[PDB]
Amino acid sequence: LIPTVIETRGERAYDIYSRLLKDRIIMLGSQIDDNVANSIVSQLLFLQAQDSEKDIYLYINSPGGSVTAGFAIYDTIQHIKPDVQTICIGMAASMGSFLLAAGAKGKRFALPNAEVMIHQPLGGAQGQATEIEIAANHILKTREKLNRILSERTGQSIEKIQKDTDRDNFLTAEEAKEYGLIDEVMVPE
């Protein structure tokens, strides 16, 4: 079940996630596919139309998923006028950590015991040599694209990103900070 919350100009009933969206909080708390991406793009656009000045809060607890779906979110984040803060809670892996890195400069956060993981894109291809070749070049170009943006966003060289993403690379919040994937570890109120 998703719990319901009720506020008391009338009495309005909200599912907990909708209630958070009313305070400009978007939950990316699952594997990233086209459906999750559509929902989050819609939310971003709606929040912008309501107010193009106020910050947005993107909660990321996600193992990642589709690169293109992740980029649908990424590009929408960069297009809209409001700063989109990113907050890692639990883990951010794959495009999950890419999106965390994509938050507004100075406003990328993770809570202390959150886990950040970076690695190289995964894919698959079968058929003729020529089809294998196309699929190879495609995922290689996609990786260059990902790594270039990470370099811009973290301050690390493409050479270093390439090394450090060659195999699964698990980072503490703190380590994610010094790497430049986030700006700040959120310390207890």
Ligand X SMILES: CC[C@H](C)CNC(=O)N1CCC(=O)N2[C@@H]([C@@H](C)CC)C(=O)N(Cc3cccc4ccccc34)C[C@H]12
> Contacts with ligand X: how many residues (CB under 6 A)?
14
- Supply the minimum distance, in Å, between the C-beta of residue 66 and Mg ion: 21
Q: Are 88 and 148 in contact (CB under 8 A)?
A: no
Cα separation values, 123 from 93, 130, 138, 142, 143, Å: 16, 16, 10, 11, 11
Partner from its own copies, Mg ion, ligand X, none binding residue 4, C-beta < 5-8 Å depending on class: its own copies
- Supply the minimum distance, in Å, between the C-beta of residue 142 and its own copies: 7
Residue choice 12, 15, 34, 46 for contact with ligand X (CB under 6 A): 46
Q: Does 23 bind ligand X (CB under 6 A)?
A: yes
Total residues belonging to the chain = 189
Residue choice 56, 58, 65, 71 for contact with its own copies (CB under 8 A): 71
Q: Which sequence positions are flagged as catalytic? A: 94, 119
171 vs 98: CA distance, rounded Å: 13
Question: Which span sits near its own copies by CB under 8 A: 85-93, 153-161, 174-182?
Answer: 85-93
A 10 A CB-CB count for 25 gives 17
